[PDB]
Amino acid sequence: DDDKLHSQANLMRLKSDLFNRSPMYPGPTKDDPLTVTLGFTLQDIVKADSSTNEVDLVYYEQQRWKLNSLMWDPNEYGNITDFRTSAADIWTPDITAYSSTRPVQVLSPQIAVVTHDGSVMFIPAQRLSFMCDPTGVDSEEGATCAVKFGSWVYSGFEIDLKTDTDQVDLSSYYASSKYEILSATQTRQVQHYSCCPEPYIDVNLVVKFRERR
Amino acid sequence: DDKLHSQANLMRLKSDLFNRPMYPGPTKDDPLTVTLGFTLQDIVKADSSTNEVDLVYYEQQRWKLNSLMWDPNEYGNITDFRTSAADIWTPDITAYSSTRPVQVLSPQIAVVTHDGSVMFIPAQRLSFMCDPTGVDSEEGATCAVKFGSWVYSGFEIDLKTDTDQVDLSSYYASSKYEILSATQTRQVQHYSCCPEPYIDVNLVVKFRERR
Amino acid sequence: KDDDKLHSQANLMRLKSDLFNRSPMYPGPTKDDPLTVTLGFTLQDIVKADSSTNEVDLVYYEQQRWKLNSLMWDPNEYGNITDFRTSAADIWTPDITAYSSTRPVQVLSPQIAVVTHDGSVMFIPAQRLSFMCDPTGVDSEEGATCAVKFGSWVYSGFEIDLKTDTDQVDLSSYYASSKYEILSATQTRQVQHYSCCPEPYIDVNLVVKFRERR
Amino acid sequence: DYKDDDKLHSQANLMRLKSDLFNRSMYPGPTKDDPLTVTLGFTLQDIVKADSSTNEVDLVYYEQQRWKLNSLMWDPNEYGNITDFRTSAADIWTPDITAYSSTRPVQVLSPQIAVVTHDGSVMFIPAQRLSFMCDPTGVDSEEGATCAVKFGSWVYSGFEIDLKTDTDQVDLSSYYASSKYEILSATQTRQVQHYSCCPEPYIDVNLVVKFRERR
Amino acid sequence: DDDKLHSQANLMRLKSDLFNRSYPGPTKDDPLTVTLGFTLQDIVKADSSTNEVDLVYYEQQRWKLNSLMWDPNEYGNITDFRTSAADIWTPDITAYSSTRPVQVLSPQIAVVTHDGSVMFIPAQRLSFMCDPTGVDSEEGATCAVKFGSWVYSGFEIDLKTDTDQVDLSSYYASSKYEILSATQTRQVQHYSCCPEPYIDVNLVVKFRERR
Numbered sequence A: 001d002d003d004k005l006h007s008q009a010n011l012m013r014l015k016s017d018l019f020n021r022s023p024m025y026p027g028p029t030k031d032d033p034l035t036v037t038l039g040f041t042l043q044d045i046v047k048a049d050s051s052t053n054e055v056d057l058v059y060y061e062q063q064r065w066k067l068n069s070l071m072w073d074p075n076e077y078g079n080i081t082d083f084r085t086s087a088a089d090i091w092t093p094d095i096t097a098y099s100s101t102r103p104v105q106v107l108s109p110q111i112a113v114v115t116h117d118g119s120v121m122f123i124p125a126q127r128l129s130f131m132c133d134p135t136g137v138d139s140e141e142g143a144t145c146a147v148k149f150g151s152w153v154y155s156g157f158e159i160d161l162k163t164d165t166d167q168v169d170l171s172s173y174y175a176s177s178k179y180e181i182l183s184a185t186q187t188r189q190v191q192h193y194s195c196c197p198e199p200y201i202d203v204n205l206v207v208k209f210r211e212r213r
Numbered sequence B: 001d002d003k004l005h006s007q008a009n010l011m012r013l014k015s016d017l018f019n020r021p022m023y024p025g026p027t028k029d030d031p032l033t034v035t036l037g038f039t040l041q042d043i044v045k046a047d048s049s050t051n052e053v054d055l056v057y058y059e060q061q062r063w064k065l066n067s068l069m070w071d072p073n074e075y076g077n078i079t080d081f082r083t084s085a086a087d088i089w090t091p092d093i094t095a096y097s098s099t100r101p102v103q104v105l106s107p108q109i110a111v112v113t114h115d116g117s118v119m120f121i122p123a124q125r126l127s128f129m130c131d132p133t134g135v136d137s138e139e140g141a142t143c144a145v146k147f148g149s150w151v152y153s154g155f156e157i158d159l160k161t162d163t164d165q166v167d168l169s170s171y172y173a174s175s176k177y178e179i180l181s182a183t184q185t186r187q188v189q190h191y192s193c194c195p196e197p198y199i200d201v202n203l204v205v206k207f208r209e210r211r
Numbered sequence C: 001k002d003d004d005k006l007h008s009q010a011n012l013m014r015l016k017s018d019l020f021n022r023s024p025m026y027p028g029p030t031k032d033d034p035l036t037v038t039l040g041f042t043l044q045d046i047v048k049a050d051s052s053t054n055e056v057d058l059v060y061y062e063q064q065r066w067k068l069n070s071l072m073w074d075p076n077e078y079g080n081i082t083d084f085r086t087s088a089a090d091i092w093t094p095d096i097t098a099y100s101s102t103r104p105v106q107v108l109s110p111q112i113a114v115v116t117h118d119g120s121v122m123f124i125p126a127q128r129l130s131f132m133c134d135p136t137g138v139d140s141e142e143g144a145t146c147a148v149k150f151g152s153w154v155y156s157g158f159e160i161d162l163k164t165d166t167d168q169v170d171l172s173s174y175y176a177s178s179k180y181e182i183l184s185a186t187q188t189r190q191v192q193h194y195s196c197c198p199e200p201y202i203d204v205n206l207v208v209k210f211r212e213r214r
Numbered sequence D: 001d002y003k004d005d006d007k008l009h010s011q012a013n014l015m016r017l018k019s020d021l022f023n024r025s026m027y028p029g030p031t032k033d034d035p036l037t038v039t040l041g042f043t044l045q046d047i048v049k050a051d052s053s054t055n056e057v058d059l060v061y062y063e064q065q066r067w068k069l070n071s072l073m074w075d076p077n078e079y080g081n082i083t084d085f086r087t088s089a090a091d092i093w094t095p096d097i098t099a100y101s102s103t104r105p106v107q108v109l110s111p112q113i114a115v116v117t118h119d120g121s122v123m124f125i126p127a128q129r130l131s132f133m134c135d136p137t138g139v140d141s142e143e144g145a146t147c148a149v150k151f152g153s154w155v156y157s158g159f160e161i162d163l164k165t166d167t168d169q170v171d172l173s174s175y176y177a178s179s180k181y182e183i184l185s186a187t188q189t190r191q192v193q194h195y196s197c198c199p200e201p202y203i204d205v206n207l208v209v210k211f212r213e214r215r
Numbered sequence E: 001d002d003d004k005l006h007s008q009a010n011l012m013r014l015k016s017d018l019f020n021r022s023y024p025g026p027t028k029d030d031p032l033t034v035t036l037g038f039t040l041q042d043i044v045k046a047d048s049s050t051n052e053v054d055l056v057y058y059e060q061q062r063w064k065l066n067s068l069m070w071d072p073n074e075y076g077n078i079t080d081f082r083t084s085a086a087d088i089w090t091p092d093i094t095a096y097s098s099t100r101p102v103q104v105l106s107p108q109i110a111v112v113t114h115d116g117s118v119m120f121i122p123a124q125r126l127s128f129m130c131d132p133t134g135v136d137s138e139e140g141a142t143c144a145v146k147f148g149s150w151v152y153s154g155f156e157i158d159l160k161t162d163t164d165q166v167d168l169s170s171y172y173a174s175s176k177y178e179i180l181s182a183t184q185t186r187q188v189q190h191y192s193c194c195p196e197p198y199i200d201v202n203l204v205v206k207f208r209e210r211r
């Protein structure tokens, strides 16, 4: 206790200084662009509906970005290096699947981890239905599917996207899924439209899969 | 540092426009024109036992409010910004013959530009009334649904399209259904119940089972 | 030009702010100040009849009308505004409910009303309803008959009286390619008395006879 | 008129009343020193469905809830003779009466509004659709299937919340005449239970239904 | 009638002092132990087309904060109380291999005791990754799902069970599935990326079609 009481007190002081003086960060702009790193950890192809061409995925989607406005000096806060906080208390990026066919279902607590250098890690678990023809899922080559993820409203001048590796993390893939993974890549792409001079960034999730035996 | 002066300018801009009374919507004396456009991504499902068809599309909405205007020079050259759709008024555009609530697939964020213009592009899945008869045939099926304001007549909201062609350039190439044609047409209507003019955009889609 | 537009806009702000205060939300009807709600249905589709569970699914506009002194204003003090649109959450709405649904109603329309300067309100929620209905004989010429009551969940006739403007359901919107065709569709006010109580209960009983399209 | 005045004055009596019970003053719930009796009663409307590949049955019913709070009493003569009012269920405390063996969330089908009367008593009657645990084995027979589900507080033991019924017969005067399922019997019975783990009594109302396919 | 007003004002008084005269979650300095146990009511559905299985259970969560302590003597000898689960902090315990959002079957209400202990027992319906193959045989099928904080390491939240027995005394005797065995076991996990320990409770269930 006491120190415990003071530890608590430090965090609460940190949280208020960060949030309640200087209202919420207004998102990136062309002047103050931001890079968002994404990585997918695929857990499960739950279902492949060949009457509709929809496949359902369960995955953890890791988001990392970093904001100056969220740094503090740990020395000033009883040496708190980082803390967990609700996603409602901070700006999060608007990363969406560009071809889902149902609202994404969130499977995990909406809480992020923020570090003293202003970097935020946020890892939502999701079930997604997206546009995918599962033809050849019963063959040796299996079926191939793709879905792009990106910011819904920000172009490349405000949000840049990157990955650590083009390899999707399969280390958590359900061993007894109806389907088995031949490959899972996650690839940064730059889209140019003719309408518009600004580039748009997405990460392309490509999965090649196949009925298990 | 300069990066912190931009944030500050934006925060200030948003506060001026939002924290200092939300537009109460259009009036006969002060009507609004909303531009609509569809980008058909997919016909996911044709249900011949209930006559329901499920579409996924982007729905572009565009409009312009004087009270959303600023002079960029007083805000460090900011020419536009992105903000939650909750912060502004948005039009009550709806499908007139859906059979399930629409399912919003994209985040509710809008871009506001310094001339007061707003662009909002919700992705949707919609079930609407549609007889898919003929879909298994060279000529395919034709379906139609209308969109417009739910509570404003054409004295308050007028609608408009940029082209009467649905944008099909992201239509999903391995859909169960290919598209023969897809058109979005402004229409003005007079109903016996109701003496005000009614404006809608008619979405007409001819489609067949892929081969 | 932009100046005419700003005053008219500010006159609406003013009207709203004046109505939605002094003296905030009207507490609902009483025995001393009862209220009459007119309903009318506009049937768009019988989407589905499930004979394995005896549930049928209707899509309709449920048109509701009523009048509140508390929502009156003089157009003259408000730059000639005779009516305006407002989210239904800003005002009191009646608790009209199907008595025999089997799923929560799904709302298919923005929930916004029209208030006119005499205090009258017009509110048109579009709905999809699953209600108890045995669709037997639907595949014959004489078809099936199903019925559902709508009324206030909690007010007696001493507080909310219902009426219809007509006993016919409005079919002008009915989908010409539904699996189901309408033979008749009526909407009739009924007064019920129970045995617990001395107060009457009012409902509009919606009766639909339908069959498969051939 | 001086009717348009009286009306105006009936509204202000109600708005005032609501203001004195609601803003001025919110029951923190029952306690061991201040227990509460909840009266429960069912009006069964329909057995909508019986899944025998999962052993779920879906019922539709209205659940009558009734209790009384000193803190909700008022003197009608101070309030223009108002003897009772309607109000959103969110303005008042309500009991956590729950099904103990539901299998998906209860579906509410009626507006959440209660009636409060000057003696401090509240009647609240939500219509609901419940999926609960039930084998319909033998539903296609003469003798039928039996199912049970208990209802009662989720977190209050009998020392804080007690339950009673006005009758043991579930009310069937609104059962749907053309349901797939007719009702052989439906009863609603107060049970008291005592566990080893625990000194306190546990109250529930046991809802039991014998039904068979309509034939 | 007057001592009921008293004891009532006392509780109100307590809730005031606890909740608005006044937890930001646990930390490395101030860690917290959550005790969990499961009461399994039903395996509703085992789906071989998708490899999902649906359970109905009560999940007891139990923990203790110094900040919720009080001295009964100063509060009419109130020894505990019930309160909405939004009035207080709760731990982010999460199934790590669910495939649908958990559905809540019970009122979101907790019991707070004067020593600052909190007990929270939500009823849930869950879908999780489970191959039901063999459920039709005598040896049944076996499925596991781990449960843990999503965002805190072992440095801030530790977990425990009072028993590794999943309590089956309320199992639905008429389920389609009979439980062969059901356990709930703490697990510590050490990774290559990370010095932090990671704790979960592993819910493992062996079950077969009822005979």
Ligand SMILES: COc1cc2c3cc1Oc1cc(ccc1O)C[C@H]1c4c(cc(OC)c(O)c4Oc4ccc(cc4)C[C@@H]3N(C)CC2)CC[N+]1(C)C
Residues within 6 Å of the ligand: B096, B097, B146, B148, B149, B150, B151, B191, B192, B193, B194, B198, B200, C042, C044, C061, C124, C172, C173, C174, C175
């Ligand atoms: C299958 O859909 C429709 C089918 C048919 C029609 C309109 C439809 O629907 C659409 C419906 C509106 C607007 C644009 C549409 O494209 C309706 C409307 C509405 C309002 C107020 C009302 O009373 C005061 C009312 O009756 C209304 O409903 C009508 C009015 C006329 C008709 C039917 C329903 C006949 C019209 N005719 C040619 C037959 C074919 C205000 C706003 N809303 C709610 C939008």
Ligand SMILES: [Mg+2]
Residues within 6 Å of the ligand: A155, A157, A198
């Ligand atoms: Mg740009």
Ligand SMILES: [Mg+2]
Residues within 6 Å of the ligand: B152, B153, B154, B155, B156, B196
């Ligand atoms: Mg008009």
Ligand SMILES: [Mg+2]
Residues within 6 Å of the ligand: B190, B191, B192, B193
């Ligand atoms: Mg006409």
Ligand SMILES: [Mg+2]
Residues within 6 Å of the ligand: B196, C083
């Ligand atoms: Mg008008």
Ligand SMILES: [Mg+2]
Residues within 6 Å of the ligand: C156, C158, C159, C199
């Ligand atoms: Mg009465």
Ligand SMILES: [Mg+2]
Residues within 6 Å of the ligand: C156, C199
């Ligand atoms: Mg009465």
Ligand SMILES: [Mg+2]
Residues within 6 Å of the ligand: D157, D159, D200
């Ligand atoms: Mg007790």
Ligand SMILES: [Mg+2]
Residues within 6 Å of the ligand: D157, E080
């Ligand atoms: Mg107790």
Ligand SMILES: [Mg+2]
Residues within 6 Å of the ligand: E152, E153, E154, E155, E156, E196
């Ligand atoms: Mg850690």
Ligand SMILES: [Mg+2]
Residues within 6 Å of the ligand: A082, E153, E155
């Ligand atoms: Mg840490």
